[PDB]
Amino acid sequence: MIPTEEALRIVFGVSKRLPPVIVSLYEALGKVLAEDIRAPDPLPPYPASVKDGYAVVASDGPGEYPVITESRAGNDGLGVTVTPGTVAYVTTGGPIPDGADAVVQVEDTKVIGDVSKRVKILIQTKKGTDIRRVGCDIEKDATVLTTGERIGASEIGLLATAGVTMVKVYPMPIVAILSTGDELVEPTAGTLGRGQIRDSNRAMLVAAVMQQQCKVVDLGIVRDDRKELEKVLDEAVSSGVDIILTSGGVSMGDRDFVKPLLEEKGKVYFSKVLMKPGKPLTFAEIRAKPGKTVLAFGLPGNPVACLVCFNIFVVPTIRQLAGWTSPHPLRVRLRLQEPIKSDPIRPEFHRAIIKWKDNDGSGTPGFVAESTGHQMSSRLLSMRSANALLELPATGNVLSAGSSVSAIIVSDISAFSID
Amino acid sequence: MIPTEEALRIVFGVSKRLPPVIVSLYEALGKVLAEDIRAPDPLPPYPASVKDGYAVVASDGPGEYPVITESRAGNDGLGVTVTPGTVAYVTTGGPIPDGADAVVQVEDTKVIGDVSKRVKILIQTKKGTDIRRVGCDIEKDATVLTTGERIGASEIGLLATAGVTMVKVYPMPIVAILSTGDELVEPTAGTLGRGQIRDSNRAMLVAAVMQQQCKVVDLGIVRDDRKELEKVLDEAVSSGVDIILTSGGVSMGDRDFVKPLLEEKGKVYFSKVLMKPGKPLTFAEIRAKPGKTVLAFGLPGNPVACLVCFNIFVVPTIRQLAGWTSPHPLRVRLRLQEPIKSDPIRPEFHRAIIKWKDNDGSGTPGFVAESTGHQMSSRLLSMRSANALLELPATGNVLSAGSSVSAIIVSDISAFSID
Ligand SMILES: Nc1ncnc2c1ncn2[C@@H]1O[C@H](COP(=O)(O)O)[C@@H](O)[C@H]1O
Ligand SMILES: Nc1ncnc2c1ncn2[C@@H]1O[C@H](COP(=O)(O)O)[C@@H](O)[C@H]1O
Ligand SMILES: [Cl-]
Ligand SMILES: [Cl-]
Ligand SMILES: [Mg+2]
Ligand SMILES: [Mg+2]
């Protein structure tokens, strides 16, 4: 039995980033860049107006002038030179005609006459005012995005600015998922027979892998039969998947075949971890027959321990495979809203609902946590709405309300319900 | 011109939750529940062993006993009664045979004899030990999920436990997106002609709407022509979409038709907001010809102001339409890593890269922020990697390094890179 910190280190040491692929612009969203992106031209590529108004010769100053051209886009004002004593109408983003060196916004002007157009400039402007010089936002050949950067909406915007519609990125791993047990029935079952339960772990894990943006290979329910589980694992290993997730069949039962089958097919690095909830967790590396590596997690059958192990061990593995330079989850410090008894031997991953408060109890703003209640590993209601795992050390003492603890954030911090 | 707080309030007051729909189990992920979910049977539905070991009569105590049955699943041990002086083998999750009232884990036992099986119980156990009574995790008819609850992986697990494979939920709004401008070209363009730029806002907004899990209707580039924009808007309004996003054509230019076209098709609630970056932002409610409501955001053309307006005003609108009871973004308090000059008139949404530190500068853990640099509205590089918008009030003073500010978190807090 090893501590969770050592188990993570082993997983990180074994897990390798996947080979990069070439995807389309919208397929690149969520993925980590596998190449630098340089701007092929400047932004703006032409001197552009910041305002709707008039392009002027700044040294002319206030006065009445003829409007010699209008410039909004493309070739507007091409070949026209704004000389001292003249102006040109411009819209925001419009190219500045040759000779003009500043822009006066329309609110600082007044149109004069009926009908040949004439305008009164009402202020004294300075050279360069309200003009974006060539490349002031992005210089030609500047690096706008770099390898290792995760692509979000503004990064998609930067790729489109630079005219990149096919992107080199690290792909997401493909994950196979199966459940084990003679007691299981499909979640479509109505009336349950004696000694039956609905398979809940498979759909839970399929959903958790979908939240990580990975393709899922659903291998269904496998019975407690060594030859049948071996066949499904052999098929999963040769199918092309990167990660295999099983649940159940890893405790001390006489028909728990996951651990010995993974020892036979590949290298098992550990099978037991010092933690609450649970204990059994097999991690193995299998080489598929040529040729590639497949990572296997023999997750515990108890629903809570199954999901807690996914959150702590599988999520950073998916991220590492997908090329994330920072795969660790966000850890914050927070205050307890109620007392919690820690375990004397096992450090706990206590499920909690956390929120940011203007006063965390100590007079200053901060995160606070409420327990989800009874933490029994068979009680999936303890995972309901839980957005964090409080890391409670094995002191055996009662941590009182108001004391501070470390907490792992497990669900999108930007989707957090406010206080 | 109105403050951002009033503009949000108007948007919230106009925005209505969409009619609920019935979806499949995996389509329900990410969606808000539109009905309560009750367990049709208890969990476990039979008295279940917590351990791999032996089901005993607790009052027998340590001694040697015959193993009268084996119970792992279904009908194992049906009709067998464990009487005082006998035991039954059990695996974790196995049904407890009639008559047994406790379980002794296999580590507290020893198999005796060769071959009729016999086992030595090594401890004195207490009635009920290591048995999950019927319904101890979930009681029959208990409410496991309620209306207004967002479905994550554990909620999918709870639906599968309860045998629910078709779920009533609030759907995501469908969003139409278009760009405006005679200066625009597609992001596939190579060499740009004079007075041209690649359309970056459309792909940026498509990606931002994909991050919010909404279907996108891409309406392309529309030119600065009143009749053409009217036709595209009329087609978008009658297409069945819930939200229309345009960008550009909302400043003071003589060919900026978005605002007057939205005034003509529906009700414009506001067109100008006191904020940095930007100023123009049109919000309108259109009634489609029978019949349903369509919300329109005339977003600014400047890339930064376009995305900032999406993050602050469009994201909570999508969430409200999708039935979120808490659509507001997460706001935290944090310390500045460097000095920042606030504006004298406009409150700023200053882009920043934030992270949680063990020491935020004041000796206690907390969030800290670095500016993304120059905040010019034309500079999309100021949005690069920005996971927060610092809310800097309009005091005109220099906020020094180490001072505290409010910050809006705009990208998945659980995807935050650690310090
Ligand atoms: N789709 C777009 N992508 C990039 N820049 C844009 C887009 N639409 C408008 N702009 C720019 O944003 C500024 C304001 O646009 P407008 O309100 O149409 O004058 C101008 O500098 C435009 O060139
Ligand atoms: N797919 C599953 N869904 C729900 N419960 C499970 C699943 N697989 C195993 N279990 C339960 O988890 C516990 C441990 O499983 P095992 O390691 O196979 O003994 C038992 O109580 C099982 O009935
Ligand atoms: Cl436990
Ligand atoms: Cl601005
Ligand atoms: Mg089992
Ligand atoms: Mg325009």
Give the CATH number of the domain where residue B227 resides. Answer: 3.40.980.10
Pair A316, A220 in one domain: yes
Q: How far is CA A283 from CA A15, A235, B342, in A?
A: 11, 18, 52
A249 Cβ closer than 6 Å to some ligand 2 atom: yes
- Give me ligand 3 centre to Cα A327, in Å: 26
Question: How many domains in chain A?
Answer: 4
- Give me ligand 5 centre to Cα A21, in Å: 39
Q: Of chain A residues 78-117, which have a CB less than 8 A from chain B? A: 78, 89, 91-95, 105-107
**SS3 state at B321:** helix
Residues B295-305, buried b or exposed e (16+ Cβ, 10 A)? Answer: bbbbbbbbbbb
Residues B85-116, buried b or exposed e (16+ Cβ, 10 A)? Answer: ebbbbbbbbbbbbebbbbbbbbebbeeeeeee
Give yes or no for a cis peptide into B44 (omega within 30° of 0): yes
Can you read off the two tokens belonging to residue B286? Answer: 């259109």
B183 Cβ closer than 6 Å to some ligand 1 atom: yes
Q: What is the C-alpha to C-alpha distance for residues B202 and B248, in angstroms, rounded to an integer?
A: 11
* Residues of B whose CB is below 8 A from A78: 194
Q: What is the C-alpha to C-alpha distance for residues A303 and B139, in angstroms, rounded to an integer?
A: 16
Q: What is the C-alpha to C-alpha distance for residues B243 and B266, in angstroms, rounded to an integer?
A: 13
CA dihedral B313, B317, B318, B319 (to 10 degrees): 110
Q: 10 Å Cβ neighbour count for A22?
A: 12
Pair A235, A281 in one domain: yes
Residue type, B345: I
Pair B151, B273 in one domain: no
- Give me ligand 4 centre to Cα B160, in Å: 50
**SS3 state at A37:** strand
Resolution in Å, one decimal place: 1.7
Nearest to A209 by CA among A240, A247, A173: A173
Can you read off the two tokens belonging to residue B340? Answer: 């920042």
Atom of ligand 1 lying closest to residue B200 CA: 3
Pair B237, B326 in one domain: yes
Q: Where among B297, B330, B363 does a domain terminate?
A: B330
Atom of ligand 1 lying closest to residue B247 CA: 8
Q: What is the C-alpha to C-alpha distance for residues B253 and A91, in angstroms, rounded to an integer?
A: 5
**SS3 state at A351:** strand
Pair A305, A196 in one domain: yes
Pairing of the two strands B143-145 and B21-24? unpaired
Nearest to A4 by CA among A329, A223, A290, A324: A329
CB B122 within 8 A of CB B108: yes
Give yes or no for a cis peptide into A95 (omega within 30° of 0): no
Pair B178, B325 in one domain: yes
Q: What is the C-alpha to C-alpha distance for residues B285 and B268, in angstroms, rounded to an integer?
A: 7
Nearest-by-Cβ selection for A192 from B45, B187, B331: B45
Q: What is the C-alpha to C-alpha distance for residues A401 and B357, in angstroms, rounded to an integer?
A: 23
Specify whether the backbone of A86 is left (phi greater than 0), alpha (psi in -120 to 50) or beta: beta
- Could you write out the DSSP letters of every residue in A174-235? PEEEEEE-TTEE-TT--SPPTT-EE--HHHHHHHHHHHTT--EEEEEEE-S-HHHHHHHHHH
Nearest to B200 by CA among B188, B182, B213: B188
CB B368 within 8 A of CB B354: yes
Would you give the distance in Å from CA B150 to the centre of its chain? 8
Range of the domain at A77: 44-137
**Distance between A276 CA and the closest CA of chain B, angstroms:** 15
The CA-CA-CA angle for residues A198, A204, A206, to 5°, reads 115
Pairing of the two strands B243-247 and B293-299? parallel
Q: Which of A184, A245, A246, A257 best tests ligand 2's pocket when mutated (most atoms within 8 Å of CB)?
A: A184
Strand order in the sheet with B109-112: B102-105, B53-56, B87-90, B63-71, B118-121, B109-112
Size of interface A-B (CB pairs under 8 A): 355
Q: What is the C-alpha to C-alpha distance for residues B338 and B135, in angstroms, rounded to an integer?
A: 56
Q: Of chain B residues 133-192, which have a CB less than 8 A from chain A? A: 136-138, 144-145, 149-150, 152-165, 181-183, 187-192
Q: Which residue of A has its CA nearest to B156?
A: A204
Pair A291, A277 in one domain: yes
Q: What is the C-alpha to C-alpha distance for residues B77 and B93, in angstroms, rounded to an integer?
A: 14
Sign of CA dihedral B367, B368, B372, B377: positive
Pair B150, B269 in one domain: no
Q: 10 Å Cβ neighbour count for B24?
A: 10
Q: How far is CA B195 from CA A78, A115, A130, B305, in A?
A: 10, 29, 17, 21
Q: What is the C-alpha to C-alpha distance for residues A49 and A132, in angstroms, rounded to an integer?
A: 6
**SS3 state at A259:** helix
Q: Where among B330, B364, B383 does a domain terminate?
A: B330
Experimental technique: X-ray
Residue type, B165: T
Bridge partners for B11 per DSSP: none
In which element (H, E) is residue B86 found?
Answer: none
The CA-CA-CA angle for residues A171, A174, A176, to 5°, reads 170
In which element (H, E) is residue A275 found?
Answer: none
- Give me ligand 5 centre to Cα A43, in Å: 61
Q: How far is CA A46 from CA A41, A76, A100, B107, B278, in A?
A: 10, 12, 13, 79, 22
Q: 10 Å Cβ neighbour count for A247?
A: 29
Gaps in chain A (C to N over 2.5 angstroms) fall after: 115, 290
Q: What is the C-alpha to C-alpha distance for residues B185 and B181, in angstroms, rounded to an integer?
A: 9
Pair A307, A341 in one domain: no
B150 Cβ closer than 6 Å to some ligand 1 atom: no
Q: Which of A92, A106, A130 best tests ligand 1's pocket when mutated (most atoms within 8 Å of CB)?
A: A92
Nearest CA to ligand 2 atom 9: A301
**SS3 state at A101:** coil
CB A34 within 8 A of CB A147: yes
Pair A320, A180 in one domain: yes
- Give me ligand 2 centre to Cα B153, in Å: 17
In which element (H, E) is residue B304 found?
Answer: helix B303-309
Q: How far is CA A69 from CA A59, A80, A300, in A?
A: 19, 7, 75
Give the CATH number of the domain where residue B155 resides. Answer: 3.90.105.10
Q: How far is CA B295 from CA B17, B244, B249, B267, in A?
A: 12, 6, 18, 10
Pair A33, A146 in one domain: yes
CB A133 within 8 A of CB A47: yes
Residues B37-53, buried b or exposed e (16+ Cβ, 10 A)? Answer: bebebbbbbbbbbbbbb
Can you read off the two tokens belonging to residue B365? Answer: 């853990």
Strand order in the sheet with B267-274: B2-3, B267-274, B280-287, B293-299, B243-247, B175-180, B216-222
Q: How far is CA B153 from CA A84, A186, B233, B329, in A?
A: 68, 17, 38, 21
Q: Where among B112, B137, B162 does a domain terminate?
A: B137
Q: What is the C-alpha to C-alpha distance for residues B179 and A330, in angstroms, rounded to an integer?
A: 36
Residue type, B18: L
Contacts 24+ apart (CB under 8 A), B359-362: B360/B334, B360/B335, B361/B335, B361/B337, B361/B401, B361/B402, B362/B335, B362/B402
Q: What is the C-alpha to C-alpha distance for residues A303 and A384, in angstroms, rounded to an integer?
A: 12
Residues of chain B by 3-state class (helix, strand, coil), percent to 5: 20, 35, 45
A280 and chain B in contact, CB less than 8 A: no
Nearest CA to ligand 2 atom 21: B93
A200 Cβ closer than 6 Å to some ligand 2 atom: yes
Q: How far is CA B142 from CA A266, A319, B28, B42, in A?
A: 44, 37, 21, 9
- Could you write out the DSSP letters of every residue in A286-346? EEPP---EEEEEEE-SSHHHHHHHIIIIIHHHHHHHTT-S--SPEEEEEEESS-EEPPSSS
Q: Which of B177, B182, B184 best tests ligand 1's pocket when mutated (most atoms within 8 Å of CB)?
A: B184
Give the CATH number of the domain where residue B412 resides. Answer: 2.40.340.10
Pair A11, A64 in one domain: no
Q: E strands along A78-165, which residues?
A: 87-90, 102-105, 109-112, 118-121, 131-132, 143-145
- Give me ligand 6 centre to Cα A128, in Å: 21
Nearest-by-Cβ selection for A41 from B72, B192, B332: B192
Q: What is the C-alpha to C-alpha distance for residues A394 and A361, in angstroms, rounded to an integer?
A: 25
Q: 10 Å Cβ neighbour count for A38?
A: 15
